[PDB]
Tab-separated table of C-alpha atoms and ligand atoms in Angstrom:
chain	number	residue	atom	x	y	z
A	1	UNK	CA	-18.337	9.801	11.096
A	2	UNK	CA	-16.906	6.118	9.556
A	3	UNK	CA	-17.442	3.132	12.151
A	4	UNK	CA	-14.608	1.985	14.173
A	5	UNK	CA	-15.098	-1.679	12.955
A	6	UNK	CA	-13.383	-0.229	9.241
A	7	UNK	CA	-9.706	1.553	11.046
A	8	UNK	CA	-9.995	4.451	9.295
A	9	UNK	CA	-8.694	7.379	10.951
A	10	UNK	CA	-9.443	11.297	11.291
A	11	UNK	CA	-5.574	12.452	10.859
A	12	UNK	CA	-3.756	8.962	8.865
A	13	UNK	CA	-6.783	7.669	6.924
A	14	UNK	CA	-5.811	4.149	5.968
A	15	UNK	CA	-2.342	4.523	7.660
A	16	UNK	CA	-2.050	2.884	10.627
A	17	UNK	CA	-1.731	5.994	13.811
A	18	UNK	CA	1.010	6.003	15.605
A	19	UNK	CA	2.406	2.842	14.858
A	20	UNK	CA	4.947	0.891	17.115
A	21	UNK	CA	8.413	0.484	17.018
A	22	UNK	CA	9.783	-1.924	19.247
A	23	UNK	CA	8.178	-5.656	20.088
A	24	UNK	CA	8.185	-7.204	23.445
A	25	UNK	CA	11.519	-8.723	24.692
A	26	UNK	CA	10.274	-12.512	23.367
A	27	UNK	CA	10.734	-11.507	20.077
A	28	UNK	CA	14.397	-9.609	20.272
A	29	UNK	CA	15.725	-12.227	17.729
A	30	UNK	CA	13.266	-11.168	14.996
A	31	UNK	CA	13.886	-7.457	15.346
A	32	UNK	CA	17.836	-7.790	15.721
A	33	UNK	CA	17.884	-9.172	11.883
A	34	UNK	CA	14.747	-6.783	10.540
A	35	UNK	CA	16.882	-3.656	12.158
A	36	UNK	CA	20.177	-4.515	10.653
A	37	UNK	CA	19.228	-5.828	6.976
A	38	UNK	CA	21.793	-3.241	5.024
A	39	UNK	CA	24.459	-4.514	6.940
A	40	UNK	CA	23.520	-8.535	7.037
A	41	UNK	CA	22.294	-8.572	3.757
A	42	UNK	CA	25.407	-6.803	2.467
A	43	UNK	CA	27.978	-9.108	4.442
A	44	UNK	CA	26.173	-12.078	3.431
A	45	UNK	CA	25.375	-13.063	6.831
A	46	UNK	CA	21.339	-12.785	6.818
A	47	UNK	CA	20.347	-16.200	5.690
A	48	UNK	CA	22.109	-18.203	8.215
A	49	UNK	CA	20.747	-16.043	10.661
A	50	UNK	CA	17.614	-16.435	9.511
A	51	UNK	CA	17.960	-20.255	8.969
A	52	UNK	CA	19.690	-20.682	12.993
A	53	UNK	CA	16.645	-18.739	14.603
A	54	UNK	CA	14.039	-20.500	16.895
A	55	UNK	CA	10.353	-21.171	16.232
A	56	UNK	CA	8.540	-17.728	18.428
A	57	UNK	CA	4.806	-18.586	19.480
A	58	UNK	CA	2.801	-15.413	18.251
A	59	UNK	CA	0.589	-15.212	20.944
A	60	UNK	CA	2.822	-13.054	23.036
A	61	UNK	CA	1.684	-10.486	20.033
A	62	UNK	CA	-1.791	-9.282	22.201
A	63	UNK	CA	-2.993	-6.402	20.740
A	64	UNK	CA	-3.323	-5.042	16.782
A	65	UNK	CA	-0.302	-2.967	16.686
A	66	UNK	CA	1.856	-5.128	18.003
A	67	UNK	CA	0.788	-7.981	15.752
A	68	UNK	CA	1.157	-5.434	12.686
A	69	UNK	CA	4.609	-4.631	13.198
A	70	UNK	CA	5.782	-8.087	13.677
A	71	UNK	CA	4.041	-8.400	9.951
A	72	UNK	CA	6.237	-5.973	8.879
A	73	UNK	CA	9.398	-7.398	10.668
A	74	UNK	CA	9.079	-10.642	9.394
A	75	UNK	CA	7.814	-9.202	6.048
A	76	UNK	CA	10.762	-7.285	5.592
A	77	UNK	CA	13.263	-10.223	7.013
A	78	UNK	CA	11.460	-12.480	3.903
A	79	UNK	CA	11.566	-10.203	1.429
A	80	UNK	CA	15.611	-9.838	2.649
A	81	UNK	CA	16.024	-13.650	2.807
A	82	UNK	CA	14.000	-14.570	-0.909
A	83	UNK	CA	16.380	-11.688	-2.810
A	84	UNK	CA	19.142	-11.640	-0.782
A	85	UNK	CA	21.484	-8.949	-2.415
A	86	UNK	CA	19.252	-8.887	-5.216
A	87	UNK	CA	21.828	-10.468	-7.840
A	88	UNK	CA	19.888	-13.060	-9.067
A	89	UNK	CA	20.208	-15.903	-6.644
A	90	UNK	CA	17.014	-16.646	-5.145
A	91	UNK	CA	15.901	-19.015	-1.737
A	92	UNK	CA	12.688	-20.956	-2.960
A	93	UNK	CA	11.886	-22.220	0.395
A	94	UNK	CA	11.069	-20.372	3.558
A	95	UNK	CA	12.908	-21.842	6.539
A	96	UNK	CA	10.052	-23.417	9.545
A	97	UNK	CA	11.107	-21.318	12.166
A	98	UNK	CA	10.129	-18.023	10.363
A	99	UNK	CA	7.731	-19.148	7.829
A	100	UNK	CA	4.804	-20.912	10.354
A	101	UNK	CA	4.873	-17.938	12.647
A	102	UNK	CA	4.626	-15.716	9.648
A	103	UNK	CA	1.910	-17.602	8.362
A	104	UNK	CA	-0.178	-18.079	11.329
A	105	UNK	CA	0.116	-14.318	12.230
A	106	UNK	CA	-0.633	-13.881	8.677
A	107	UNK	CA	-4.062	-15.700	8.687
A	108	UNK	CA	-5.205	-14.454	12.280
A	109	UNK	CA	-5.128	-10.735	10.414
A	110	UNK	CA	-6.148	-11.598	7.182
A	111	UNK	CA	-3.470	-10.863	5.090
A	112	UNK	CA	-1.085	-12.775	2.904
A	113	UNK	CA	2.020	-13.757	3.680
A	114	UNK	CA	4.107	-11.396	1.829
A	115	UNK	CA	5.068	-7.578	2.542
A	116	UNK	CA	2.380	-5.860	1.454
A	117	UNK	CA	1.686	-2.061	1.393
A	118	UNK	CA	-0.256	-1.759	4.684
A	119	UNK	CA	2.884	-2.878	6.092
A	120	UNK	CA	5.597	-1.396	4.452
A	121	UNK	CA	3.887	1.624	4.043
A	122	UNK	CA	0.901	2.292	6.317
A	123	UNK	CA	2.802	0.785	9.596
A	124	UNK	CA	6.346	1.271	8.373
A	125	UNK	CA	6.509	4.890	10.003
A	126	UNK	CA	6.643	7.431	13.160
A	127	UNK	CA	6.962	10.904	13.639
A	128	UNK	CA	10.690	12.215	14.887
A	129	UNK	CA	9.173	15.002	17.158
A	130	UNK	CA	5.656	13.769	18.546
A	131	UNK	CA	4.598	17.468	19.186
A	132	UNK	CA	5.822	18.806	15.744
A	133	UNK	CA	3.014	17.580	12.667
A	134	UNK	CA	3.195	14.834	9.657
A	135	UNK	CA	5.991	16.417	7.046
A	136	UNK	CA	8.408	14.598	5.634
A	137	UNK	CA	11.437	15.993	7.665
A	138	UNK	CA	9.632	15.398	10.853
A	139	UNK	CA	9.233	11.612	9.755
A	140	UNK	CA	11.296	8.305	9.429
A	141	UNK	CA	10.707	4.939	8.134
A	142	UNK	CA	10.855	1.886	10.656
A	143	UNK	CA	12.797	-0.520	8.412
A	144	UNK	CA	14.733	-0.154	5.375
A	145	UNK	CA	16.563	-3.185	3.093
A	146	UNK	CA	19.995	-1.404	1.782
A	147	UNK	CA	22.072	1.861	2.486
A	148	UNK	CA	20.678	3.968	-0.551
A	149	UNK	CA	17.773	1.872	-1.606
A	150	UNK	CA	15.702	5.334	-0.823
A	151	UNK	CA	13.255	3.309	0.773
A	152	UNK	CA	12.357	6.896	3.536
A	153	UNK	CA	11.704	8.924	0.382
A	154	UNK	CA	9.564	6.308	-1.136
A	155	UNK	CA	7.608	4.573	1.855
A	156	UNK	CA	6.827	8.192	3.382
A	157	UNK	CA	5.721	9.873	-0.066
A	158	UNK	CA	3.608	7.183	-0.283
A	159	UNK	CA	2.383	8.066	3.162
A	160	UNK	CA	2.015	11.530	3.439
A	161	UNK	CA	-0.476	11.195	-0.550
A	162	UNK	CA	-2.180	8.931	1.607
A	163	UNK	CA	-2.523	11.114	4.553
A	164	UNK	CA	-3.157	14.023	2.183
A	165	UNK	CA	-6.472	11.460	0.819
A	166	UNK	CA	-7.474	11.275	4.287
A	167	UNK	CA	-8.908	14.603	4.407
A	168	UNK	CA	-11.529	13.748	1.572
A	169	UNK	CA	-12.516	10.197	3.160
A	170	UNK	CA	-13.746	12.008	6.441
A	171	UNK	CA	-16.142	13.430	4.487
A	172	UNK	CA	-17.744	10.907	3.069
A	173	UNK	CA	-20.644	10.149	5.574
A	174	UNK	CA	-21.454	13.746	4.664
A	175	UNK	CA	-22.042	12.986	1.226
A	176	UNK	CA	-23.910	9.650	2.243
A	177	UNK	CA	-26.146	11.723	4.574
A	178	UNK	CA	-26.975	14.872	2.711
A	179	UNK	CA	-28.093	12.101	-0.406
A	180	UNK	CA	-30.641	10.107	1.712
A	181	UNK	CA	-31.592	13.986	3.598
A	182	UNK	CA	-31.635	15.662	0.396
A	183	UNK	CA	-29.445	18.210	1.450
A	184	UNK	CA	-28.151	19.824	-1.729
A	185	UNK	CA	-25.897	22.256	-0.887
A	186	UNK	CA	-24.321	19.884	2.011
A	187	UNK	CA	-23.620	17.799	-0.628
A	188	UNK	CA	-22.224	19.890	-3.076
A	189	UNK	CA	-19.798	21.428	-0.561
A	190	UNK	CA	-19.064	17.769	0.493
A	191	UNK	CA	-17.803	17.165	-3.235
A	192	UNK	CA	-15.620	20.494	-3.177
A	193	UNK	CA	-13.842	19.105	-0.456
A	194	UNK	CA	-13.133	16.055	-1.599
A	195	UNK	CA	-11.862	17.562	-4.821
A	196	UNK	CA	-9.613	20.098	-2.820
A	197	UNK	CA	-8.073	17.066	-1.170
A	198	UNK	CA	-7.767	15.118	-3.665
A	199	UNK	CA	-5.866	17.898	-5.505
A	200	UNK	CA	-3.718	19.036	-2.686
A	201	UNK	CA	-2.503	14.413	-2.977
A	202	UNK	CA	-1.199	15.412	-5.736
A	203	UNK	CA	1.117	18.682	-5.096
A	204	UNK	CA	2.369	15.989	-1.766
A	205	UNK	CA	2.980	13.164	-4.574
A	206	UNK	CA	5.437	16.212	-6.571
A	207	UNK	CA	8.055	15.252	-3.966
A	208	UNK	CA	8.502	11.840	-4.876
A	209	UNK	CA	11.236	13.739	-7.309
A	210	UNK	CA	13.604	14.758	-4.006
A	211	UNK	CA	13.323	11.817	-2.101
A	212	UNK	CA	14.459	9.239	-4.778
A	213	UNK	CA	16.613	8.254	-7.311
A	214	UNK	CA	15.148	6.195	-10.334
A	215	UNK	CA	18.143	4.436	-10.438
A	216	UNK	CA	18.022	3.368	-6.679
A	217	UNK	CA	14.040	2.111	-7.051
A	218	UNK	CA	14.604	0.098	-10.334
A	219	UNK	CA	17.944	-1.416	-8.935
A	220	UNK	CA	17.039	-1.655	-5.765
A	221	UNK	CA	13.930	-1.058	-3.998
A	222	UNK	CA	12.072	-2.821	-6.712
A	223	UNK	CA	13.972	-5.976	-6.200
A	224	UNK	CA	12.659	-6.295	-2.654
A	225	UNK	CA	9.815	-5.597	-3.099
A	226	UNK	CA	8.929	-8.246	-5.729
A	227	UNK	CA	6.682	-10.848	-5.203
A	228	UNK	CA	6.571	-14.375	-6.650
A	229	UNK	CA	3.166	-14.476	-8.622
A	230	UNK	CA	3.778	-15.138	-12.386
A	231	UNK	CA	7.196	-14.053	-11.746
A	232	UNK	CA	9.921	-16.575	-13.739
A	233	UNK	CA	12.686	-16.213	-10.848
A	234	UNK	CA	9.936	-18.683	-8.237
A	235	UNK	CA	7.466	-20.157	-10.872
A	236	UNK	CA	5.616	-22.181	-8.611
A	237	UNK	CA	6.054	-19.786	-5.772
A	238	UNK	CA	7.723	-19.984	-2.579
A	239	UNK	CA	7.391	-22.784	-0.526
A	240	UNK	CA	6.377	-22.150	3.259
A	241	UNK	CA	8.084	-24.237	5.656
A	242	UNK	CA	5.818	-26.687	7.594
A	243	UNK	CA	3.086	-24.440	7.059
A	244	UNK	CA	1.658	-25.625	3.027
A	245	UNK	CA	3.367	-28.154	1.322
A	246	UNK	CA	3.516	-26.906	-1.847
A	247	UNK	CA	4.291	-23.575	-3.041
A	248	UNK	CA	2.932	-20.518	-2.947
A	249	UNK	CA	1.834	-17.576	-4.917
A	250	UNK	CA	1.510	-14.190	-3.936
A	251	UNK	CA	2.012	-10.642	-5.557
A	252	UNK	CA	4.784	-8.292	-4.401
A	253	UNK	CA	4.006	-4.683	-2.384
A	254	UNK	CA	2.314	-1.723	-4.821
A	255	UNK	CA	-0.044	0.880	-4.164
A	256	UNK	CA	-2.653	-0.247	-6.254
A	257	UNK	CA	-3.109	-2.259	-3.039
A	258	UNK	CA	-4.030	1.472	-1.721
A	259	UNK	CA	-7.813	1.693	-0.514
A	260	UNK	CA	-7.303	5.461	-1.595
A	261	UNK	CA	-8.052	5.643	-5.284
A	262	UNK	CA	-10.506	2.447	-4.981
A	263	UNK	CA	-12.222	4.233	-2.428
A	264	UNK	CA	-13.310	7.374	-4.811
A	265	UNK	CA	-13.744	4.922	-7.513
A	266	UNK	CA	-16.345	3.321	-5.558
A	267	UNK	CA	-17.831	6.901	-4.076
A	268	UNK	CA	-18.047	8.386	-7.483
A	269	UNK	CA	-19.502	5.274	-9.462
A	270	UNK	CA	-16.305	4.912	-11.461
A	271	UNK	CA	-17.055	1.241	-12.439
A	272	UNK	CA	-13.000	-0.004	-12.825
A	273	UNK	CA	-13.843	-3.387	-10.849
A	274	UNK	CA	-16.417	-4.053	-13.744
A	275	UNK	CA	-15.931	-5.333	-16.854
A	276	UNK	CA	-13.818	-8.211	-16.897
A	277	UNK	CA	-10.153	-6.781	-18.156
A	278	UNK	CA	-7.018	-7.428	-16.733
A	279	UNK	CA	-7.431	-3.801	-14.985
A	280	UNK	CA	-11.003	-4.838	-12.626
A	281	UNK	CA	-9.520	-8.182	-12.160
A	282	UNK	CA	-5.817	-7.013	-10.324
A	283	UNK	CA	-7.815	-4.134	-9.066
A	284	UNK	CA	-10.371	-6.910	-7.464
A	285	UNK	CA	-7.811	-9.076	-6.752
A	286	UNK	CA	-5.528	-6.956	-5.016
A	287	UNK	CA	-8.307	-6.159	-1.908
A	288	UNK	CA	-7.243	-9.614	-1.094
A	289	UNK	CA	-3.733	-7.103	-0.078
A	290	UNK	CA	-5.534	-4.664	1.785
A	291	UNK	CA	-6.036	-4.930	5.632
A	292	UNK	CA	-9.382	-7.541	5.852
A	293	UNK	CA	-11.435	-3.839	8.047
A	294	UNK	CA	-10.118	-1.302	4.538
A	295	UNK	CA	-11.897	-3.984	2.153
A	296	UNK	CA	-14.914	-4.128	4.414
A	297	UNK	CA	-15.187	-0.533	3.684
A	298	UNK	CA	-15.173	-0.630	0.033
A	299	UNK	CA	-17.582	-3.285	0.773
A	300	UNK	CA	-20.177	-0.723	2.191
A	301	UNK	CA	-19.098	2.080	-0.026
A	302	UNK	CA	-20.420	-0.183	-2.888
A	303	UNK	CA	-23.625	-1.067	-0.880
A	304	UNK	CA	-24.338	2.386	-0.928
A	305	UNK	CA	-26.597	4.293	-2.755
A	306	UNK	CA	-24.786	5.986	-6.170
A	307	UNK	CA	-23.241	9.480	-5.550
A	308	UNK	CA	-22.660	9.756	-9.373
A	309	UNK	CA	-26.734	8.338	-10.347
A	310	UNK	CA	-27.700	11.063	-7.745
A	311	UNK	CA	-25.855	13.963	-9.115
A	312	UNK	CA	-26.998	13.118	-12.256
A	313	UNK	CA	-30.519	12.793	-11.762
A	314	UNK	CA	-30.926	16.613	-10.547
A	315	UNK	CA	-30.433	18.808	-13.431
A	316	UNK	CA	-28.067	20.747	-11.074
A	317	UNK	CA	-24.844	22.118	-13.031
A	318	UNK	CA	-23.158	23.126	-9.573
A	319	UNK	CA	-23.273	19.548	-8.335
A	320	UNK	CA	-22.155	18.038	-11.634
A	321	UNK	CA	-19.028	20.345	-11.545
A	322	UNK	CA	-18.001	19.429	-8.414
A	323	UNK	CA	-18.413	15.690	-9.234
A	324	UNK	CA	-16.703	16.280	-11.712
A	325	UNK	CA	-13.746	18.139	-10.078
A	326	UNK	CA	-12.962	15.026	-7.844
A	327	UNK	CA	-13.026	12.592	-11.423
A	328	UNK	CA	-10.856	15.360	-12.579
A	329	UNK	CA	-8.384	15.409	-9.581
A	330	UNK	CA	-8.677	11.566	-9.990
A	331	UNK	CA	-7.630	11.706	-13.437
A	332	UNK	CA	-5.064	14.194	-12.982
A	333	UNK	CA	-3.251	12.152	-9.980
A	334	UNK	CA	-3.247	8.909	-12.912
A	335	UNK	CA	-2.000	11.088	-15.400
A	336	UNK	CA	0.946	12.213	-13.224
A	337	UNK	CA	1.587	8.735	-11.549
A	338	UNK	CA	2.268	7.520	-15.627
A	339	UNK	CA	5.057	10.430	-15.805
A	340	UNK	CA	6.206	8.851	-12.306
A	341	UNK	CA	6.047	5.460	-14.185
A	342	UNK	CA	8.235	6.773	-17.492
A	343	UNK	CA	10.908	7.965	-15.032
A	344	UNK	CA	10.988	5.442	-12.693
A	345	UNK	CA	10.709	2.234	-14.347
A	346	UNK	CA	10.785	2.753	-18.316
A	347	UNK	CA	13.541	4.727	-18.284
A	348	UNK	CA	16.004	2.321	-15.773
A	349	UNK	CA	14.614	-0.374	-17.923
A	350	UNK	CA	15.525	0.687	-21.369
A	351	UNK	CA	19.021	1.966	-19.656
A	352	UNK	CA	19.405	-1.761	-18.643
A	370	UNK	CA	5.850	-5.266	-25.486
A	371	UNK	CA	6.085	-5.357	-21.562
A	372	UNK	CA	6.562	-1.785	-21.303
A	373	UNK	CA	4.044	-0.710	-23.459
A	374	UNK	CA	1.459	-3.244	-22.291
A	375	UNK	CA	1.776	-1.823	-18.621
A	376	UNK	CA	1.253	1.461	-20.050
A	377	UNK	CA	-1.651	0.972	-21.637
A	378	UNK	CA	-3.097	-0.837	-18.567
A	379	UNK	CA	-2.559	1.945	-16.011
A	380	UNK	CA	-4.246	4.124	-19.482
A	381	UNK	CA	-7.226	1.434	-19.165
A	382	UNK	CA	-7.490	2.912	-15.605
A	383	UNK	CA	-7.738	6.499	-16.040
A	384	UNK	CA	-9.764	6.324	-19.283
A	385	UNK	CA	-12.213	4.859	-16.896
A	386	UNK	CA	-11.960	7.586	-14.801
A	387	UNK	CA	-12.196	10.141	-17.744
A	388	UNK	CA	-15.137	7.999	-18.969
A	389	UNK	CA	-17.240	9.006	-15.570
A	390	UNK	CA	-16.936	12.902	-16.263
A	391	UNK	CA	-20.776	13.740	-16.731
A	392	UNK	CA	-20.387	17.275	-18.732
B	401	HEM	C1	8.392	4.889	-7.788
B	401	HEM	C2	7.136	5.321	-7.935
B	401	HEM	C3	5.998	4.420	-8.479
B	401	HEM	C4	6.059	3.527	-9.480
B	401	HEM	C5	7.281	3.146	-10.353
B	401	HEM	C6	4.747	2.937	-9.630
B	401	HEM	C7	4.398	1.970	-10.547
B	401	HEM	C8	3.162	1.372	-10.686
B	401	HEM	C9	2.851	0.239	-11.536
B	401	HEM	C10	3.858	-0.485	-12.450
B	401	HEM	C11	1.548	-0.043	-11.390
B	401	HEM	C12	0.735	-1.152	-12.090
B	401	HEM	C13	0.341	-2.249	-11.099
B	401	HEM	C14	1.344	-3.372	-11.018
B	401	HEM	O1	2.128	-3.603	-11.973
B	401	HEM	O2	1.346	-4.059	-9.968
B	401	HEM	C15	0.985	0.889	-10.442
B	401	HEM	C16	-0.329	0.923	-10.023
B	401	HEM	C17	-0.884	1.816	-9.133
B	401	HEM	N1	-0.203	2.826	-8.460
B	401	HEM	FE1	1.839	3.101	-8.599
B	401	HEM	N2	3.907	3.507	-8.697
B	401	HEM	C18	4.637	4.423	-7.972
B	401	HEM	C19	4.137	5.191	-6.941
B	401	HEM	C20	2.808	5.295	-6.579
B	401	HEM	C21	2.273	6.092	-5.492
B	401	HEM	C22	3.104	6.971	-4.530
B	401	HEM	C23	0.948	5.933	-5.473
B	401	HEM	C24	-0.045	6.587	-4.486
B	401	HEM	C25	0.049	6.328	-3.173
B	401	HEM	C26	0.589	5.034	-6.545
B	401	HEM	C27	-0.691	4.614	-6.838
B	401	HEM	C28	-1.049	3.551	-7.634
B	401	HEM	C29	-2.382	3.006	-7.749
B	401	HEM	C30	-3.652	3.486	-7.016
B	401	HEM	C31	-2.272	1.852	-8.747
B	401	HEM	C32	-3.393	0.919	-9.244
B	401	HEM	C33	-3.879	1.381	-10.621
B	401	HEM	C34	-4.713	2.635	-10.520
B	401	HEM	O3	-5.638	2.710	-9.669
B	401	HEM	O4	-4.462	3.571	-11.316
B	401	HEM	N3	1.749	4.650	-7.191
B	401	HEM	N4	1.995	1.737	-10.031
B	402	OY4	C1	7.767	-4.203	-6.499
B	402	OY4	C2	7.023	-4.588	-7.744
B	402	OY4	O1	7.645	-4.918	-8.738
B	402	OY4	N1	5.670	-4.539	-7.705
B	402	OY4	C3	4.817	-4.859	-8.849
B	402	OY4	C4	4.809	-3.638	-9.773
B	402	OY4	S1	3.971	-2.226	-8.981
B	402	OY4	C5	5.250	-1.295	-8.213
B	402	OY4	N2	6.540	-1.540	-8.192
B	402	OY4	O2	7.106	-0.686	-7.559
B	402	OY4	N3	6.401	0.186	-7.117
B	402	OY4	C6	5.144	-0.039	-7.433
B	402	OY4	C7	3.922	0.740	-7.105
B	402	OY4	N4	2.796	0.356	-7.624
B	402	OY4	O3	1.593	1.053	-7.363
B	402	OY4	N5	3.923	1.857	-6.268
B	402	OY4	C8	5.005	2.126	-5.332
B	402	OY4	C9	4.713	3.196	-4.289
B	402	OY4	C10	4.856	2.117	-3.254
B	402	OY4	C11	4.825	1.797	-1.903
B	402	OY4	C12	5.049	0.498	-1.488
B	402	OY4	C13	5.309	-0.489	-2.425
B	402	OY4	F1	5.521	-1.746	-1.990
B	402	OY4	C14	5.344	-0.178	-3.782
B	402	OY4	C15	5.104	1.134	-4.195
């Protein structure tokens, strides 16, 4: 079993469990504005509600839960107040009174000071019926920006591939152990798994299709969700009130700041992180997004011993096909998150070299992957 230092668990995986939905009283003032964000953001009201709120100590945030959802309240409330109705005018500074607390939550978990996907995604969630399991109709979302942004279709798809993944990371001591025990048929059933799981993600990300509109993400949800690293609408960044002096940068929410897909890169030797490109270097750089306990797990995945220099050392055909069913499923889930990519961006966008340059860098990634297949 994983070590309770890296918050990985059984059921949820990376997701945080049972997240929570309501702060203590003290901080009533933040969560009245992250609850209502369709409606204050569409009325044009958000801003100065924002900019006539107090200064809130954090410390009455005591325990890890608590402390992530105020991330994702005041995440959400910045992403809100930077975009506003996501026309084109933009707020370059963060007001004090939200942007210290922010920050000095921000730094006492280890995380930037932007929405990330461990917020928006991993603690942005519950279950409607406790006693009834994790499917999509017995889910919501905690916070949303606008009425039909299809933020529940796309934060809980999201979720429920990476609760699918979850199944295959459980395993993984089981590979670990069966290599230094030289248990072959442990590990070879250990791989199968994996690969099962791994293949079953994908049929879970096939409902992405009836839970958003392309139209609604590109529009929309995608606005939001931008960040202001390299992006021409903040150049310099965004300036955080009383907290830096000068501006910011930081990149806006994706799931390549996922430690699902890195994590079976690392487990099957898939080097992506190597070889200088612009693909190892966002994948590298965007650990710096993960929760600081998910990228001291890839950490020790990589200090590991190599599953892939193992299986290959053997002369075992049984092992090397179910290695190389978990690169395939791997592969496959790429292959269909491009198709995802054509609809959901390239599409809106021509409707509206970039294009083709992102392409070929998500192409980069899976030709890695491909690459690793040993037969
Ligand atoms: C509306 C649907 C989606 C769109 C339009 C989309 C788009 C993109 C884009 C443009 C990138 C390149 C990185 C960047 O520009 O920051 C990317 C990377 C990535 N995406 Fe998505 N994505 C979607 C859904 C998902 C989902 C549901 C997952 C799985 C949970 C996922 C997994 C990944 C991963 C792991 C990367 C990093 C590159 C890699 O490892 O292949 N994406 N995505
Ligand atoms: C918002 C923006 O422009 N980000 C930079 C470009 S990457 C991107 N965009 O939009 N979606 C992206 C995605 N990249 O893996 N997966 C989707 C699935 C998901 C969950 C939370 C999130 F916050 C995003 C996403």
């Amino acid at each position: 079993m994983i070590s309770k230092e890296y918050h990985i668990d059984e059921e949820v995986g990376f997701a945080l469990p049972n997240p929570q939905e309501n702060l203590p009283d003290f901080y009533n003032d933040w969560m009245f504005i992250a609850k209502h964000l369709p409606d204050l953001i569409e009325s044009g009201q958000l801003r100065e509600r924002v900019e006539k709120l107090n200064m809130l100590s954090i410390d009455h945030l005591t325990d890890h839960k608590s402390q992530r959802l105020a991330r994702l309240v005041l995440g959400c409330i910045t992403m809100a107040y930077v975009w506003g109705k996501g026309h084109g005018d933009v707020r370059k500074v963060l007001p004090r009174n939200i942007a210290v607390p922010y920050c000095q939550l921000s730094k006492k978990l280890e995380l930037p000071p932007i929405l990330v996907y461990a917020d928006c995604v991993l603690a942005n969630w519950k279950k409607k019926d406790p006693n009834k399991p994790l499917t999509y109709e017995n889910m919501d979302v905690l916070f949303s920006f606008r009425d039909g942004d299809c933020s529940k279709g796309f934060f809980l798809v999201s979720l429920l591939v990476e609760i699918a993944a979850a199944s295959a990371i459980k395993v993984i001591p089981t590979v670990f152990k069966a290599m230094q025990m030289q248990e072959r048929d442990t590990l070879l059933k250990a791989l199968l798994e994996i690969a099962s799981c791994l293949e079953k993600a994908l049929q879970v990300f096939h409902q992405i299709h009836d839970h958003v509109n392309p139209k609604a993400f590109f529009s929309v949800l995608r606005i939001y969700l931008s960040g202001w690293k390299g992006n021409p609408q903040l150049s310099d960044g965004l300036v955080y009130e009383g907290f830096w002096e000068d501006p910011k940068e930081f990149a806006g929410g994706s799931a390549g700041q996922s430690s699902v897909f890195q994590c079976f890169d690392v487990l099957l030797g898939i080097q992506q992180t190597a070889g200088g490109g612009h693909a190892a270097q966002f994948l590298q750089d965007m650990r710096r997004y993960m929760p600081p306990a998910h990228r001291n797990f890839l950490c020790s995945l990589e200090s590991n011993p190599s599953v892939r220099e193992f299986v290959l050392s053997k002369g075992d055909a049984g092992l090397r096909e179910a290695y190389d069913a978990c690169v395939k499923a791997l592969v496959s889930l790429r292959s269909y998150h491009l198709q995802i990519v054509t609809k959901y961006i390239l599409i809106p966008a021509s409707q509206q070299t970039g294009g083709t340059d992102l392409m070929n860098f998500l192409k980069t990634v899976r030709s890695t992957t491909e690459k690793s297949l040993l037969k």
